[PDB]
XYZ file of C-alpha atoms in Angstrom:
28
model
C -104.216 -85.768 5.570
C -102.951 -82.420 6.933
C -100.316 -81.495 9.546
C -100.077 -77.995 10.979
C -96.730 -77.906 12.777
C -96.574 -80.666 15.233
C -100.281 -81.880 15.435
C -100.010 -83.975 11.979
C -103.617 -85.765 11.212
C -102.834 -89.170 9.306
C -104.207 -89.629 5.847
C -107.952 -90.572 6.096
C -109.446 -87.703 7.578
C -112.644 -88.109 9.227
C -114.708 -85.005 9.650
C -117.945 -85.523 11.340
C -120.879 -83.982 9.662
C -124.515 -84.046 9.858
C -126.325 -87.162 8.369
C -126.342 -88.815 6.340
C -122.811 -87.365 5.534
C -121.513 -88.131 9.103
C -118.003 -89.129 9.633
C -116.856 -88.820 6.006
C -113.716 -90.355 6.349
C -111.780 -89.685 3.455
C -108.027 -89.821 1.390
C -106.512 -86.651 2.723
């Protein structure tokens, strides 16, 4: 999970990559 200033991305970050990675969705 990460927050820059106001925009805080909750833990469980889904980053979309080409397949078969795709939307990874990992604990961060």
